[PDB]
Amino acid sequence: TETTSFSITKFGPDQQNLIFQGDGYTTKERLTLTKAVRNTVGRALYSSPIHIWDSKTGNVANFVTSFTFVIDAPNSYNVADGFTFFIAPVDTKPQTGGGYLGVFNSKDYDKTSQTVAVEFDTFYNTAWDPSNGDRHIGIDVNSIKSINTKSWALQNGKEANVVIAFNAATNVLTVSLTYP
Amino acid sequence: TETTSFSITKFGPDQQNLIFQGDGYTTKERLTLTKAVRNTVGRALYSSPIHIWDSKTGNVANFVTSFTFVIDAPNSYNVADGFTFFIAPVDTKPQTGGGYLGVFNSKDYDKTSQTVAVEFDTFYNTAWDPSNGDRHIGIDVNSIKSINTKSWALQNGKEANVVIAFNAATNVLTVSLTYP
Amino acid sequence: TSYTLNEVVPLKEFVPEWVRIGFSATTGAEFAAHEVLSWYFHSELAG
Amino acid sequence: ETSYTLNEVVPLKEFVPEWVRIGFSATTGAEFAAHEVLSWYFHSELA
Ligand SMILES: C[C@@H](O[C@@H]1[C@@H](N)[C@H](O)O[C@H](CO)[C@H]1O)C(=O)O
Ligand SMILES: C[C@@H](O[C@@H]1[C@@H](N)[C@H](O)O[C@H](CO)[C@H]1O)C(=O)O
């Protein structure tokens, strides 16, 4: 049996158990992935690898993560691109920016990507996003095209709490966002 | 608040959340630091840095670790050198082998070491070890000469259960080793 | 106001045995500040 | 049922950096023994 757990209630300026990529850094006790500035990507990874399954036994792990995040736009109409929680290979590195959320490089399914992400997508990219143009939560596996989506109305500058849990026995991934 | 937790009940061959140094590797469910071979050093580190105290608020962490380990020697007379659990800078690298146990370089106090270790020492090195010549448990800070030691009788080949706890309100470090 | 989504995602088919987890956020021609205020994670793998 | 306990006051903040790595080491020299760890659990909390 293996377990990994951690919590960070407040982020400090030297948060050495995280790996920062792009412009992500910690400031005013927050993890800042992007400032309100054009064309940037920020990522932050937990420094320890996690053993999500074992080939020798076939066992798969359960996990739960909860986090509070905020998106702050100028106004609630010109807001982009969104945010992701992702699971990727140990050596992951930023992929395309903009509507690919730094995590995918095609709308086409790519088995070499090996990453699944829960996105909170704030901008409609006609080419792969829900046709109704709404902002939405989606589960992405190897592509920026979600396997499923749920519309969400962004409360600009509000703190949002999310819980994501994976249950290995039923293979179910549940995502919950709440604005309190 | 910042928490780090993990458990590894059974190590397996690709233990990626461990950094191996020297000749340490994982085999047949075990973390092997040394085989029963002359002149070797093996160390293994958890991969994530842990925040043990904070300069901005002056708070230091509470922690507890427990592990079981085995020392298997040809016989009970010719046994050496020992085993350590240590805390050290993020960039720590193996120091001197033999009686220095891979973590220190001298019996002289060196504040540049920044390493505290609990040692389980099986060989009497007359230059710094307790002159009664007994195998012993010791707490080492910045030197291989322990600030305090307790005599321990090795049960060769048997598993030993260790708990090491640090209480930050009193700054007391407690070590206990139990054989069944 | 809560929003829940659930799906079956046989993780063993898509990701390696060892993975790293984290967050990502981007901007393009339009933009927004993206920030995380706290994070808790727990995983367990039987063996 | 055979135990050995050692207690000491060690003001860690004076000796160790704020961010540390933790782990195990073992060595042999002219004499030797196998040193192996079978399980490990760790928990820390910094208020
Ligand atoms: C992914 C797509 O990204 C879009 C980007 N090109 C556009 O400039 O700005 C919008 C909104 O910020 C992005 O969604 C691309 O071109 O790579
Ligand atoms: C470092 C010190 O270590 C000792 C080693 N060199 C000695 O000869 O063999 C014993 C038993 O293994 C060690 O304690 C030294 O002599 O160099």
Ligand SMILES: [Ca+2]
């Ligand atoms: Ca989009």
Ligand SMILES: [Ca+2]
């Ligand atoms: Ca010794």
Ligand SMILES: [Mn+2]
């Ligand atoms: Mn989308």
Ligand SMILES: [Mn+2]
């Ligand atoms: Mn000693």
